[PDB]
C-alpha cells in the first residue's frame, strides 16, 4: 500500500503528504514538514515550474514568531522556482526547523 | 498516484523507494539515495527497531573508494537502530554523500 510509503517519509524525511490532486493550474500536494520544534504547512505545485504556497492564515500568533525566529523572510512568502532546486529548498526548510 | 509520491520525494529528499515488501522478518523497502556525487543502495526493514542493509556487491571498487572517503565506517555495515533515530540516519546519509 501507499499509506506505508507516506508513513516512511514522515519519520525518514520529516515531510508528511496529506493529499495529492491535479487541477487546471497543475499538480499539488498538501504538505506538512517538521518536528516538535517547528512545523510548517504548505502546498507544493508543479507546472517544470515549482510553486510553494505557505499556509499561515490559520496559524497561531504564538507559533509564528518562533518560526520567524528560525526561518528566513522568503520562507514566509509564496515562491516559484525550478525543479532542480527542490532538494535545496528541502535543505532550507529542514535546517530552519531544527533550530 | 503512488508514482507521483515516489517522484516528489526523489527530488525533494534524494530518496527513491523502488519497492516495498513484507515478509516474516518484517516490512522492507528497497531504497537508493544520492545525487551525482554519491549514490547508496540499501534495504530499510522494521520489526520498534529499524534495520539497515547496504548493498555493496553490485558496486565497483572505484565506486566503493569514493564512498569510503565520504562515509563513516559504520555506514558500510548492517545497522540496527530505533525508529526515533530514523531521521538522524537520513541526515547523516544525505549529508555524507553530498560531501
Amino acid at each position: 500500500t501507499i499509506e506505508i510509503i507516506k508513513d516512511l517519509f514522515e519519520h525518514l524525511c520529516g515531510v508528511r503528504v496529506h493529499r495529492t490532486y491535479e487541477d487546471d493550474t497543475g499538480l499539488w500536494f498538501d504538505t506538512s514538514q517538521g518536528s516538535k520544534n517547528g512545523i510548517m504547512d504548505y502546498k507544493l505545485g508543479f507546472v517544470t515550474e515549482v510553486i510553494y504556497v505557505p499556509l499561515l492564515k490559520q496559524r497561531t500568533a504564538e507559533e509564528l514568531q518562533e518560526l520567524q525566529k528560525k526561518l528566513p523572510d522568503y520562507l514566509f512568502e509564496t515562491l516559484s522556482f525550478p525543479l532542480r532546486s527542490l532538494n535545496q529548498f528541502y535543505i532550507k526548510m529542514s535546517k530552519s526547523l531544527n533550530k | 498516484t503512488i508514482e507521483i509520491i515516489k517522484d516528489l520525494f526523489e527530488h525533494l529528499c534524494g530518496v527513491r523507494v523502488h519497492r516495498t515488501y513484507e515478509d516474516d522478518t518484517g516490512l522492507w523497502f528497497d531504497t537508493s539515495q544520492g545525487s551525482k556525487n554519491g549514490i547508496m543502495d540499501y534495504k530499510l526493514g522494521f520489526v520498534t527497531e529499524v534495520i539497515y542493509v547496504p548493498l555493496l556487491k553490485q558496486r565497483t571498487a572505484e565506486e566503493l573508494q569514493e564512498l569510503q572517503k565520504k562515509l563513516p565506517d559504520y555506514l558500510f555495515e548492517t545497522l540496527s537502530f530505533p525508529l526515533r533515530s530514523l531521521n538522524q540516519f537520513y541526515i547523516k546519509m544525505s549529508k555524507s554523500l553530498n560531501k
Partner: peptide, 20 residues
Amino acid sequence: YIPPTILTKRRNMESFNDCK
C-alpha cells in the same frame, strides 16, 4: 509497521481546504 507521526493530525486542518 510504523507509528503515526505528529504531522498526521494536520491532514484535517482548515488551511488546506482552499484550492483557489
